[PDB]
């Protein structure tokens, strides 16, 4: 699993070389599909290894959602040091996996035949994507996960081909996805940055290390005000849905890879849900909503001490500014996250985030987040032109 493009340049991709994606070496100057839309689709599911079977997961079934939560909590993405693992909650998963237009067949599980134990998963959700000068109906692929005991058995290519088949059956032939590894071929590369909010706990769990400053000097450095500074800041409410939709749509036009959300999708992704998604709007002295900030909740199991309290992290989502300076908006995001008990605030260097990351004392993380398109060949772009945030 290559983490850098220099490592990835030296190897071959037995599976990805078969797929409609550009080659790693390619410099792309065209815009469009790699292969034509298929007018006949394989009706039979792809063959799994002996003793495993497909199962679409009904997440409205509490027991099935618990199985998925358990698979991901024990087998999903870990940091490069293998010390923390994402701890997606069942309520979070419902938010991420049942947006408007979700389909049950796109919650694609793999189970042991004899015991029915869940050992693999991959998901698709529909999304309208603007990529340069084209708007296309696509799916977002997420939560690809194979049980640790089943790894390195080429189950992941089967999962990918099967979700591809099931998306094709619905008349969709492009996809977007992100990964921490380098594959053919990233459309953009972003880097995660982190902002300490509770430096004491971060040092204790070895998320960060006391850089030479004292513990006292470190806490003073990362101290934040107790209340936000921006006039009119308040939680998003139902009446704000149309103006949030309007603010987001114009703001995203300046980037080259963005979602195109309906008003119902805006409600789903931004309406606040405790311990899932927070959105705050700025309502000025005229009563006009002019800006908003948002971040979602994703804690992480502390792997070496898995008994203890998990690391509570906020992730920057979409932040739109038309009257409040973005620097001030994000400073209030930090203060609000601190108030709500988050230990760290994470953001990527996409969109306009580089304008505030250093100033607000974010530190650069290890490892990249690669963005990919399936069956769409287009030039790559810098991080500041990526305007798409997945969960």
């Amino acid at each position: 699993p290559a983490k850098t493009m220099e490592e990835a340049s030296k190897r071959s991709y037995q599976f990805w070389d078969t797929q409609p994606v550009p080659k790693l070496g390619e410099v792309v100057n065209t815009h469009g599909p790699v292969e034509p839309d298929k007018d006949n689709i394989r009706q039979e599911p792809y063959t799994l290894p002996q003793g495993f079977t497909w199962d679409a997961l009904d997440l409205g079934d509490r027991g099935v959602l618990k199985e998925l939560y358990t698979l991901l909590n024990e087998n999903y993405v870990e940091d490069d040091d293998n010390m923390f693992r994402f701890d997606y909650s069942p309520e979070f998963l419902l938010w991420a996996l049942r947006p408007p237009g979700w389909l049950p067949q796109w919650h694609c599980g793999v189970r042991v035949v004899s015991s029915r134990k869940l050992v693999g998963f991959i998901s698709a959700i529909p999304a309208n994507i603007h990529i340069y000068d084209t708007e296309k109906k696509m799916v977002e692929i997420n939560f690809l996960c194979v049980h640790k005991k089943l790894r390195s058995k080429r189950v992941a290519p089967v999962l990918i081909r099967e979700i591809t088949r099931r998306v094709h059956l619905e008349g969709i032939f492009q996809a977007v996805y992100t990964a921490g590894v380098v594959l053919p071929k990233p459309v953009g590369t972003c880097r995660y940055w982190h902002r300490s909010l509770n430096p004491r706990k971060l040092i204790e769990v070895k998320f960060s290390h006391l850089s030479n400053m004292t513990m006292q000097r470190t806490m003073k450095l990362y101290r934040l005000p107790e209340t936000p500074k921006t006039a009119g800041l308040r939680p998003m409410e139902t009446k704000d849905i149309p103006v949030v939709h309007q603010l987001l749509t114009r703001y995203l036009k300046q980037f080259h890879l963005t979602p195109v959300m309906s008003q119902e999708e805006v409600e789903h992704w931004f309406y606040p849900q405790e311990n899932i998604i927070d959105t705050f709007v700025v309502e000025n002295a005229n009563g006009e909503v002019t800006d908003f900030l948002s971040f979602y909740t994703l804690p992480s199991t502390i792997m070496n001490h898995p008994t203890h309290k998990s690391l509570k992290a906020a992730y920057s989502f979409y932040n739109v500014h038309t009257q409040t300076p973005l620097l001030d908006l994000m400073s209030d995001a930090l203060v609000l996250a601190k108030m709500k008990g988050f230990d760290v605030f994470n953001a990527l260097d996409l969109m306009e985030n580089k304008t505030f990351l250093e100033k607000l004392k974010f530190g650069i993380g290890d490892g990249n987040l690669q963005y990919y398109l399936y069956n769409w060949k287009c030039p790559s772009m810098g991080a500041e032109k990526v305007g798409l945030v997945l969960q």
Partner: peptide, 7 residues
């Protein structure tokens, strides 16, 4: 987003 980073 599906990459776990830290400083």
């Amino acid at each position: 987003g599906n990459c776990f980073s830290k400083p």
